[PDB]
Paper text:
The ring-like structural maintenance of chromosomes (SMC) complex MukBEF folds the genome of Escherichia coli and related bacteria into large loops, presumably by active DNA loop extrusion. MukBEF activity within the replication terminus macrodomain is suppressed by the sequence-specific unloader MatP. MukBEF is the SMC complex of E. coli and other enterobacteria. Its SMC subunit is MukB, which associates with the kleisin MukF (Woo et al., 2009; Zawadzka et al., 2018).
In the same sample that produced reconstructions of MukBEF bound to MatP-matS, we also observed particles with disengaged heads and that were neither DNA nor MatP bound. Although the map was resolved to only 6.8 Å, which prevented determination of the nucleotide state, it was very similar to exploratory reconstructions of nucleotide-free MukBEF. Hence, we refer to it as the “apo state. The map also revealed density for the second monomer within the context of a MukBEF dimer. The MukBEF dimer is held together by an extensive interface between MukF’s MD and nWHD, which was observed previously by crystallography (Fennell-Fezzie et al., 2005; Woo et al., 2009). The two MukBEF monomers associate head to head with their MukEF subunits on the same face of the dimer. As dictated by its symmetry, the complex thus has a front and back.
Numbering used by the authors:
A (entry chain C1): 10 to 440
B (entry chain E1): 9 to 213
C (entry chain B1): 2 to 247
D (entry chain B1): 1236 to 1468
E (entry chain A1): 1434 to 1468
F (entry chain D1): 50 to 147
G (entry chain F1): 9 to 206
Write the structure that this text describes.
């Protein structure tokens, strides 16, 4: 569904080295700007400076600058505002996308765990305040202004900022991985100590981050459970449930990643670890690498193939492949499916009898099983009579009970047909 | 009857995996672990033990071991193909190349083919998959499938292991360094090849 | 939106069932019968068609469970007769596409009670073609034969438009079923299949009876290997401690 | 290592508790008999909480048991579980097996169902106190909650043009009462859910399609005759 | 038996539990002479 | 294993098939990773034996459009309240002059 | 530690070649006097030694020793192809009673070729060479080459002993009964072996 949403939206963000450079330059100028406003007269000069320091001249400065600014504006990187008085008669501003790109690199990637600590403190305070207010349980408007508007946006923003810190740790662990790789490329053997130190400090950073996360998650989970308990203080608080719902997983998710990263890192470390004793200790001087490359480039001139004892691994009798039970089976194909009204062989007459006894129920009429059985069985032959009697009894007895049963006087075996059939029954009286 | 350490090694629970898979042409490395993790402990004992079958467990300066049968080998001999050595050398470069360490040893057949075609010559290479090929993309696909099949056969012979859930992704043994037998030293590749055939390690096909 | 619907279930050469077809209701289909009427056999045949993973299938019935219901063979081999047999389901997709999924089962030879299972699927089959007729050939007077997979492929290929596919793996079977909106979850992993089978087998038994309460933990709580690795680390440390002590 | 095992077990238990209390939400007021609502309760079992505490903080204090060459690791765990919390003392099922069970974190949790039975409030849905149809409805509710989660998760991947087929089972439907069966039917159709239900007696005559099966012995083999049924008598 | 076996022969007693005036009760209709 | 399916769904709803789904998905994921949009983490147990995560750049691009963009001025009001409180607290502490 | 007698057996100077042939898959019948006697003496230990490879050292009722690979065989298995299976049954059928009236234990590739062509169905012969072929001389030559290849493959397994010349004449060892059905008292070898070949 969102696929067509995007398809018909039609959007795109991209950045050559010169364009991305111009972007950081505009961002820095804005950070230096008196009123944050950027006139096109300054954009043109910034573009000229960046191209100058990049030393390319395809066409005039004006045309290239025009194309670049138009590209970033259309790429949802700049917002343009016509203003006749402005220098160049226009003003420009960074769009949020451009802001998030410029800051991703420039704004300090504050991996410092103290940022995490202060964020956790803020989250604990705000979460306790919101849980307290939810427990206060004001009216619907108070419920909203205390548990959706402050809670929703505040907790969302700070969860996203905590995840931003996690993502900064992610980018930093990636960075140290590529840096270890590159350092191995330049120092080879001499990089072992540096790589090991980097692994140690990264492990320490991850451990401290995990400790900082676990330091508040449990209590924050208790706070969320408190909010869940309080949420039943108003029926319309279903939306709050969704937040009370969602924020739990996010929290767990954070904690999950808090551990997962280490689980990955400690694994990756071992790979790096093994690498040092599986790549360099055997290629201390790196000569094997270049010689292998050259031999690959020129293999056929040294035509050789390795000799092994691989003549036979273990030759053996072949299986009795796919030999299965079978008989070319045949069978009497089912005919047209017959139908019967739920064992109508008994249930037509079950309906008949349940009606003929529902009458006794409806009039609360005393029911003598002996007399009713005797009157009834005459309608059916002897071999069916037993099948009849059960069906009748299973109906008659459910209707009330016999009062004489509690008089202490046993009922007699009244005959109900020929051939000797008998029934012991007190007259049903109490329905 | 036997030295204490050799009987110890033969008594190790891992020993049967080692012996059997080495007889089956599998080779020793970081992967193929069950045949390596303790053979590092008894390399000399296993070598002198294997000499009885007129075969040698050979270690280069690299940490990998692999089996080589003599001319009088009791276990019969066989060899691999050129494309097998090719994929093997590419795998060895991957194993050594620290740049792909972030791969953590896991690599995909497409990465392997990309690296192979980048380092090697496409047409002169393809001459051997099919003699008549002259740059037909059908022969290029044939070569890619042959690379896949050679990777499978190398898996059978202890150079690579498919992941339990993925036959397209794989992890590499240090036995891959076997393929660098002509580059494990600074001497000429041809004279080293002569020393391998002398030690029966390699022969031209 | 019109949710897809199961139409009918065909059990061929099953224990007590030769070519039976039950037309499934849109909402509720009911089976009745006294002792040993074989209802559990029908449910087992359906679920086997749905999840042909022989390992997961282990049908202790809801009541009178265990082997005596005919399940020392996991309730598959002995619940079948000898030879070729079928379990097939027609489904009308929410896109309103008829598709007959199915599995060919065969009793494996020897004293063993294993079953050879082969998944397959058919699309474009005319709505009129009943699977019972499709899966059987009328040989002899009024006592039709059942035809193996190769004959079924021949017969279907001889029919225009219909496309018959066999899955080398149950994973692609379920992937195709899901792509046709037959499965709510993409059982990409055998674990997904395991939890799916847990849910269907619990529903089969129904309620919080002893088995359901016992396995509720498995049904709801996923397995975690972290606990296992931690326990194994403890075990290794304990072993090495004992070694040092001695 | 013992402290780490205890910590990871506790973290897993807490995460699962959060997840289950999470999944509990989103339940409509089912009307199975007197049961007017369903909910899931997850808690740590005290017998295993004490064991976890001993492992985390008092591992060394029973190292004598652990270094016992006579005891395997699972047997050592079982014997420790016998020492503390001796009301669970049990050795007829082998200590190895009970220790192995103890090597499952999930067992450590009590995982039960509460039902809003009438106006009595949420009561533990014990089978000895609930009408069996009510218990069957509770189990069906749990199953449908699970499958609802399954469908909702895959909602993104699947195009809305397809609404996935829904089909569950229920053997021995004769356990249920008419109220429970009607509540099951209304819930299933509200959820566009298909059902296959079995009972000795036809407990669903007025709803859905119905078949009856009869098994006959014939020349040393068996046949099943299937007969249709129709909505009256 | 729970009535799922109840053959023709012998004194067949129909036990049906009911509450009579709050007293737990089981009414018993007898049948015989059949078969 | 989920990224591949998501790519398949988006291309399906875009209806383009230059090559196999696998190759195109591989190229796309590699492009975003190299373009500092995704972070990859090898994990043999994971489905497809790998895991992926959004990088902060990708986060800032995705949220630029899909965040509520909360133009609601109440967000501004609560932010102003927070700023006033924090600024007074910091000015107070500076006046304390430790 | 290791059982002392197992150490004695494995240190035995006959251990290397016997072990190598066993890894190959070659059977050891009564004809291999030294190998057979060594196996009889040290079976109690060699069975454990090979089961450590998850391979069973089975002495057949015929007395010949061979390595039965389990499913978990630590020595990855190779198997006798379909043509190998039917040529092996034809070899047993060339070793059973009737051959005494025709070849007296010394057979030639012509005998096996004729028996294969006359007894085996044309359908399976085409399956061996190709389904589209039909009796052509070139297809017969390919089938004969495959017959020679499988004959040598059986030779590697000690199931056929070649007469020492390039000519393809040979004798068949008792171990060939692994191909054929187990003989019962009163059963016609021809009938059972033909039923299995059919």
């Amino acid at each position: 569904e969102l696929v067509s949403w995007a398809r018909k939206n039609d959007f795109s963000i991209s950045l050559p080295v010169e364009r991305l450079a111009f972007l950081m330059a505009i961002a820095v100028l804005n950070s230096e700007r008196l009123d944050g406003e950027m006139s096109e007269g300054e954009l043109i000069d910034a573009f000229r400076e960046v191209c100058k320091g990049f030393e390319q001249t395809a066409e005039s400065v004006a045309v290239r600058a025009n194309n670049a600014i138009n590209d970033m504006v259309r790429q949802k990187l700049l917002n343009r505002f016509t203003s006749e008085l402005a220098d160049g008669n226009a003003i420009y501003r960074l769009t949020p996308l451009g802001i998030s790109i410029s800051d991703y690199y420039i704004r300090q990637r504050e991996f410092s765990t103290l940022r995490l600590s202060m964020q956790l403190s803020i989250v604990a305070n705000e979460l306790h305040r919101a849980a307290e207010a939810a427990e206060e349980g004001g009216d619907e408007f108070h419920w909203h202004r205390n548990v959706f508007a402050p809670l929703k946006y505040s907790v969302a923003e700070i969860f996203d900022s905590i995840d931003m810190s996690q993502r900064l740790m992610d980018e930093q662990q990636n960075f140290v991985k590529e840096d270890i790789a590159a350092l191995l490329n330049q120092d080879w053997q001499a990089a072992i100590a540096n790589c090991e130190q980097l692994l140690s400090e990264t492990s320490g950073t991850l451990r401290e981050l995990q400790d900082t996360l676990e330091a508040a998650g449990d209590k924050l989970q208790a706070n969320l459970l408190r909010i869940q308990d309080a949420n039943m203080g108003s029926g319309g608080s279903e939306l709050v449930d969704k937040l009370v719902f969602d924020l739990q997983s996010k929290l767990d998710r954070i904690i999950s990643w808090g551990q997962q990263a280490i689980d990955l890192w400690i694994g990756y470390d071992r790979h790096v670890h093994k690498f040092i004793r599986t790549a360099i200790d055997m290629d201390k001087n790196r000569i094997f690498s270049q010689r292998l490359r050259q031999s690959v480039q020129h293999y056929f001139d040294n035509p050789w193939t390795l000799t092994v004892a691989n003549a036979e691994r273990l030759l053996d009798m072949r299986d009795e492949e796919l030999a299965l039970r079978n008989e070319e089976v045949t069978g009497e194909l089912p005919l047209e499916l017959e139908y019967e009204e739920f064992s109508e062989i008994n249930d037509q007459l079950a309906a008949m009898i349940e009606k003929a006894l529902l009458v006794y129920q409806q009039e609360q009429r005393p029911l003598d099983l002996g007399a009713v059985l005797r009157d009834y069985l005459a309608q059916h032959p002897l071999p069916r009579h037993f099948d009849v009697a059960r069906i009748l009894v299973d109906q008659a007895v459910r209707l009330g009970v016999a009062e004489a049963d509690f008089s202490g006087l046993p009922a007699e075996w009244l005959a109900i047909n020929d051939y000797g059939a008998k029934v012991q029954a007190h007259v049903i009286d109490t329905y | 009857f036997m030295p204490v350490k050799l009987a110890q090694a033969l008594a190790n629970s891992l020993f049967p995996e080692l012996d059997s898979q080495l007889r089956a042409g599998r080779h020793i490395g970081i992967d193929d672990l069950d045949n390596h993790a303790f053979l590092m402990d008894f390399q000399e004992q296993l070598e002198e033990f294997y000499a009885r079958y007129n075969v040698e467990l050979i270690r280069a300066p690299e940490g990998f071991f692999y089996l080589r049968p003599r001319s009088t080998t009791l276990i019969p001999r066989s060899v691999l193909s050129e494309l097998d050595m090719m994929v093997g050398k590419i795998l060895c470069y991957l194993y050594l190349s620290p740049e792909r360490l972030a791969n953590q040893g896991i690599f995909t057949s497409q990465e392997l083919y990309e690296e192979l075609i980048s380092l090697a010559d496409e047409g002169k290479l393809m001459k051997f998959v099919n003699q008549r090929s002259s740059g037909s993309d059908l022969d290029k696909q044939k070569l890619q499938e042959k690379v896949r099949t050679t990777l499978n056969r190398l898996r059978r012979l202890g150079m690579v292991y498919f992941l339990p859930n993925n036959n397209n992704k794989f992890t590499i043994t240090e036995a891959v360094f076997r393929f660098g037998a002509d580059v494990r030293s600074g001497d000429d590749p041809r004279e080293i090849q002569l020393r391998m055939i002398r030690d029966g390690e390699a022969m031209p096909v | 939106i019109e949710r897809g619907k199961f139409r009918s279930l065909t059990l061929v050469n099953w224990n007590g069932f030769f070519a039976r077809t039950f037309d499934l209701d849109e909402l509720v289909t009911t089976l009745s019968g006294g002792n040993g009427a074989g209802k559990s056999t029908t449910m087992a045949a359906f679920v086997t068609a749905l999840i042909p993973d022989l390992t997961l299938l282990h049908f202790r019935n809801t009541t009178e469970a265990g082997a005596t219901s005919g399940s020392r063979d996991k309730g598959l081999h002995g619940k079948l007769r000898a030879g070729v047999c079928y379990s097939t389901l027609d489904v009308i997709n929410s896109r309103h596409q008829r598709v007959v999924v199915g599995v060919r089962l065969q009793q494996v030879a020897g004293r063993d009670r294993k079953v050879d299972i082969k998944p397959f699927m058919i699309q474009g089959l005319p709505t009129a073609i009943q699977p019972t007729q499709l899966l059987t050939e009328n040989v002899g007077e009024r006592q039709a034969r059942v035809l193996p997979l190769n004959e079924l492929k021949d017969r279907l290929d001889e029919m225009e438009g219909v496309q018959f596919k066999q899955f080398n793996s149950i994973t692609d079977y379920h992937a195709q079923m899901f792509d046709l909106g037959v499965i709510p979850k993409r059982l990409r992993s055998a674990s997904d299949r395991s939890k799916f089978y847990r849910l269907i087998e619990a529903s089969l038994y129904g309620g919080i009876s002893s088995a359901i309460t016992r396995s509720l933990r498995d049904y709801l709580l996923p397995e975690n290997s972290g606990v296992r690795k931690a326990f194994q680390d403890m075990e290794a440390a304990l072993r090495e401690n004992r070694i040092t002590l001695e | 290592s013992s402290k780490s095992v205890a910590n990871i077990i506790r973290k897993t238990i807490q995460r699962e508790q959060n997840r289950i209390r999470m999944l509990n939400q989103g339940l409509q007021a089912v009307s199975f008999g007197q049961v007017r609502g369903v909910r899931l309760n997850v808690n740590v079992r005290e017998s295993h909480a004490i064991l976890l505490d001993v492992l985390s903080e008092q591992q060394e204090q029973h190292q004598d048991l652990f270094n016992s060459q006579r005891l395997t690791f699972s047997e050592a765990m079982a014997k420790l579980y016998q020492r503390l919390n001796p009301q669970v003392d049990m050795g007829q099922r082998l200590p190895q097996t009970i220790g192995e069970e103890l090597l499952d974190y999930r067992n450590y949790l009590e995982l039960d169902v509460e039902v809003n039975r009438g106006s009595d409030g949420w009561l533990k849905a014990e089978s000895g106190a609930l009408s069996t149809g009510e218990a069957i409805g509770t189990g069906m509710s749990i199953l449908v909650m699970v499958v609802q989660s399954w469908e909702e998760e895959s909602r993104r991947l699947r195009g809305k043009d397809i609404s996935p087929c829904r089909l569950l089972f229920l053997d021995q439907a004769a356990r249920l009462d008419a109220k429970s069966i009607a509540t099951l039917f209304e819930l299933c159709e509200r959820l566009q859910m298909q059902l296959i239900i079995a009972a000795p007696e036809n407990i669903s005559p007025e709803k859905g399609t119905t078949y009856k099966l009869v098994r006959k012995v014939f020349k040393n083999h068996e046949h099943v005759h299937v007969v249709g049924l129709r909505g009256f008598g």
